[PDB]
Amino acid sequence: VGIRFCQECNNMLYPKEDKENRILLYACRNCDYQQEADNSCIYVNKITHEVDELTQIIADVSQDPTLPRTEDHPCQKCGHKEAVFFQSHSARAEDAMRLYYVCTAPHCGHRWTE
């Protein structure tokens, strides 16, 4: 799923097929450095696009003076009783009125939806 760079000329390693041992070989097209593939899959295309933005929001958003705050929902990892919540603010806005939270305690940065 990732990418492979040549170890000699630092370029993009293409996948190739050899008719001897039935194993995927990654080859270069400037030099001919070789090696075998460990996962033996090339292409993947996610159309659902249901990526949870809990992996994209940053912990320093709790320094924003223009975001609402809450005393109801406390943090689990530290027990702080003050959070700051917001919406998806991104694409995939068909049914996007969820409410992600971020703890505001210094050096906690814990994030969670509900």
Partner 1 sequence: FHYKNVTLGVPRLKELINISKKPKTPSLTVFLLGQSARDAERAKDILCRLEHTTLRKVTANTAIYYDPNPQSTVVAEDQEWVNVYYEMPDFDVARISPWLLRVELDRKHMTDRKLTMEQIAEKINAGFGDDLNCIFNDDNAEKLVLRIRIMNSDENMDDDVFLRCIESNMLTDMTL
Partner 2 sequence: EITPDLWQEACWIVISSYFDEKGLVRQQLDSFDEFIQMSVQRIVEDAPPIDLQPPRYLLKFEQIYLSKPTHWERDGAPSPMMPNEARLRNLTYSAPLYVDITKTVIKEGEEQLQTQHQKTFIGKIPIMLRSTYCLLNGLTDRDLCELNECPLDPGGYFIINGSEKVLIAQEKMATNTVYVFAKKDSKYAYTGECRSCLENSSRPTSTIWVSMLARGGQGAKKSAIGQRIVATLPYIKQEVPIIIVFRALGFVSDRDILEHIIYDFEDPEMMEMVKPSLDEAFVIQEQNVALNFIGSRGAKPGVTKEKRIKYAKEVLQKEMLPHVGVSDFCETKKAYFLGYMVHRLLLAALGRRELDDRDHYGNKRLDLAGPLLAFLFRGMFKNLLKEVRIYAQKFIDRGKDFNLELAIKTRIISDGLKYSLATGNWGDQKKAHQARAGVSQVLNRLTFASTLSHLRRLNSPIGRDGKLAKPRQLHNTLWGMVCPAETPEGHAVGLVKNLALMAYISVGSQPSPILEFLEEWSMENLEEISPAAIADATKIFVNGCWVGIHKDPEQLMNTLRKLRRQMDIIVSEVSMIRDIREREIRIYTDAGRICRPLLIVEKQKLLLKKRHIDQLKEREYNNYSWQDLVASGVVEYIDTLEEETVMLAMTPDDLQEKEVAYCSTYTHCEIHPSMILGVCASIIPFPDHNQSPRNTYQSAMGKQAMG
Partner 3 sequence: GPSSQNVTEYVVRVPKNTTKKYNIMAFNAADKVNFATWNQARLERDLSNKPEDQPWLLRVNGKSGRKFKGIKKGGVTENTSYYIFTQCPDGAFEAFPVHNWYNFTPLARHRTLTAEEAEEEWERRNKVLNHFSI
Interface residues with partner 3 (CB under 8 A) are 8-9, 30-31
Nearer to partner 1, 20 or 71 (CB): 20
The answer on whether 78 is annotated among ligand-binding residues is: yes
Q: Which is nearer to partner 2, 51 or 78 (CB)?
A: 51
Give the total residue count for the chain: 114
Q: What's the rounded Cα separation, in Å, for the pair 26 and 74?
A: 50
Q: Quote the CA–CA distance of 10 and 16 in Å, as a whole number.
A: 18
User: 79 contacts which partner out of partner 3, Zn ion, partner 1, none, CB within 5 to 8 A by kind?
Assistant: none
Annotated ligand binding at 28? The verdict is: yes
d(CA 49, CA 52): 9
